[PDB]
């Protein structure tokens, strides 16, 4: 015998990547029964290639992935129901949650923020009209908060990977990529940005060579325009003096981790990859889909950095997200990449000591359950 609870996770497409990662970890590491309800199967196919876009129910990585139908097909409610990123539950599911002998624990999983105030709202109950309460669950970088998603053994695996030239070379070769000696590796997952050409020009004109790895999409179209090339296909390589550009193939989440672990600088987008780039223990650039979140993260992340690096890093990140002048900050920032890399490893190690979000979520249910029946803890 072992304890197992059931979890309903609803996501309407914040970042399906975050919800899928959480669902997988609840099933794999905690042995929970997880149903993931997705209202857009095409969005889920983006993040999970092996899925069936027409199947109403399918089991992937121990998670029961179900289509969020219109109209909603009534089902019984799980022990825990998570609304990811303030999507609205089906009316019949709220009834199902109420009808249980023990009503479902109702959680809202919030977007990640470094803002200090989320600590005052984490685990806050809110009595709803139907008579149930829902609890806000705020991921965060400091206590109190719901922590960050992080798989068991992740940093140990990352350290072994980064310590092995052959593991890195073999992985990059599986993407079609071969690093040149002395070439800095930069991954570029971003949104459209008018400041990108000025930054490409700085990479082209530098003394140290760079390899810029770019996935298909809108930014790739902008890179093609700057290259003055009509089409950029997966595997294509173009050289402009010190800058080499290569187009990446599609990558599942775990392979994207390995790419982050190889690169010397990862430009990332979206809430999931922002955290994955931090676990990589490497310099990163975050493009956000906002000023309060950006500035709050910079305050915390830069707190332990030397003043000169912190100034150039903040200036570059703010300009990267404002689309403004990038020249001055990058020149100074590029010269500080080795120092920044040592600080990025320290940051990942420090965050790695905090209990991870999935563990906090399972513990929240345990304590809630014991309190519901007025038992000791």
Curated annotation (Swiss-Prot):
Catalytic activity: dTDP-beta-L-rhamnose + L-arginyl-[protein] = N(omega)-(alpha-L-rhamnosyl)-L-arginyl-[protein] + dTDP + H(+)
Keywords: Glycosyltransferase, Transferase
Enzyme Commission code(s) on record: 2.4.1.-
Active site: 15 (proton acceptor), 271
Domain of life from the UniProt record: Bacteria
Membrane-spanning segments: none
Record's keyword annotation contains Zinc-finger: no
Signal peptide feature range: none
Binding site for dTDP: 191, 251-253, 269-273
Residues bound to dTDP-beta-L-rhamnose: 191, 251-253, 269-273
Knockout or disruption consequences: Reduced bacterial fitness and reduced pathogenicity.
Gene Ontology MF terms in the entry: protein-arginine rhamnosyltransferase activity
Role: Protein-arginine rhamnosyltransferase that catalyzes the transfer of a single rhamnose to elongation factor P (EF-P) on 'Lys-32', a modification required for EF-P-dependent rescue of polyproline stalled ribosomes.
Domain remark in the UniProt entry: Adopts a GT-B fold and acts as an inverting enzyme that converts the beta-configuration in the dTDP-beta-L-rhamnose donor to the alpha configuration in the N-linked (Rha) arginine product.
Family of the protein in this entry: Belongs to the glycosyltransferase 104 family.
Protein name, as recorded: Protein-arginine rhamnosyltransferase
């Amino acid at each position: 015998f072992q304890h197992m609870a059931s979890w309903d996770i609803f996501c309407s497409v914040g970042d399906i990547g975050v919800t899928w990662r959480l669902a997988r970890q609840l099933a794999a590491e905690h042995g929970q029964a997880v149903r993931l309800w997705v209202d857009e199967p095409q969005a889920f196919a983006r993040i999970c290639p092996r899925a069936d876009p027409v199947a109403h129910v399918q089991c992937l990585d121990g998670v029961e992935v179900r289509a969020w139908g219109r109209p909603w097909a009534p089902v019984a409610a799980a022990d825990v129901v998570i609304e990811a990123f303030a999507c609205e539950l089906p009316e019949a599911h709220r009834q199902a949650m109420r009808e249980r002998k023990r009503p479902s624990l109702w959680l809202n999983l919030e977007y990640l923020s470094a803002e200090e105030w989320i600590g005052s709202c984490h685990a806050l109950p809110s009595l709803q009209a139907c008579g149930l309460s829902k609890y806000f669950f705020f991921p965060g970088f400091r206590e109190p908060s719901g922590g960050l998603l992080r798989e068991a053994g992740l940093l140990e695996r990352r350290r072994r990977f980064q310590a092995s030239v052959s593991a890195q070379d073999e992985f990059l070769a599986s993407l079609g990529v071969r690093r040149k000696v002395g070439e800095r590796l930069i991954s570029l997952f971003a949104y459209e940005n008018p400041a990108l050409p000025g930054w490409l020009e700085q990479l082209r004109d530098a003394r140290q060579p760079s390899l810029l790895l770019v996935p298909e999409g809108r930014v790739l179209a902008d890179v093609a325009d700057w290259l003055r090339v009509a089409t950029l296909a997966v595997g294509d390589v173009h050289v402009r003096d010190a800058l080499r550009v290569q187009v990446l193939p599609f990558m599942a989440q775990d392979d994207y981790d390995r790419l982050l672990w190889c690169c010397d600088l990862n430009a990332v987008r979206g809430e999931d990859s922002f955290v994955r780039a931090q676990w990589a223990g490497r310099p990163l650039l975050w493009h956000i889909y906002h000023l309060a979140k950006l500035e709050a993260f910079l305050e915390l992340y830069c707190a332990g950095l030397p003043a000169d690096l912190a100034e150039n890093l903040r200036t570059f990140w703010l300009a990267w997200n404002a689309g403004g002048g990038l020249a001055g900050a990058w020149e100074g920032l590029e010269r500080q990449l080795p120092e920044w890399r040592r600080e990025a490893q320290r940051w990942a190690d420090e965050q790695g000591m905090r209990p991870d979000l999935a563990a906090r979520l399972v513990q929240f249910y345990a304590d809630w359950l014991l309190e519901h029946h007025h038992h000791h803890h």
